[PDB]
Copies of this chain bind each other. A is one copy, B any other.
Amino acid sequence: TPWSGYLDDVSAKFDTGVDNLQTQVTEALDKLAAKPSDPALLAAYQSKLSEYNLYRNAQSNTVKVFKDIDAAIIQNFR
């Protein structure tokens, strides 16, 4: 927060793009852990975990792409 760059901004836009998934997934995790045989709890967990996976993958590739654009420009200062 005190200091953040452009890459930090690109990253943070996902962390606020998904409002509460960050907690929902941990919540569902222990609801299930209390009763791992309930079909409704299983189905509820499978989708939240899939959405968390895709959220992290999509976040990381973007930051890499921007790093490569910036390194390519900086290479030409000399």
Q: Which residues of A contact B (CB under 8 A)?
A: 2-3, 5-8, 10-11, 13-14, 16-22, 24, 29-30, 32-40, 42-43, 46-78
Contacts and interface: CB of A to CB of B under 8 A. Distances in A.
Interface of A is mostly: helix
Contacts of A61: 74, 76-78
A71 B51 contact: no
23 contacts: A2-B19, A3-B19, A3-B20, A3-B21, A7-B37, A8-B47, A13-B30, A14-B36, A36-B55, A39-B73, A42-B70, A43-B59, A46-B77, A50-B67, A53-B65, A53-B69, A57-B69, A57-B71, A58-B77, A60-B76, A64-B76, A64-B78, A65-B78
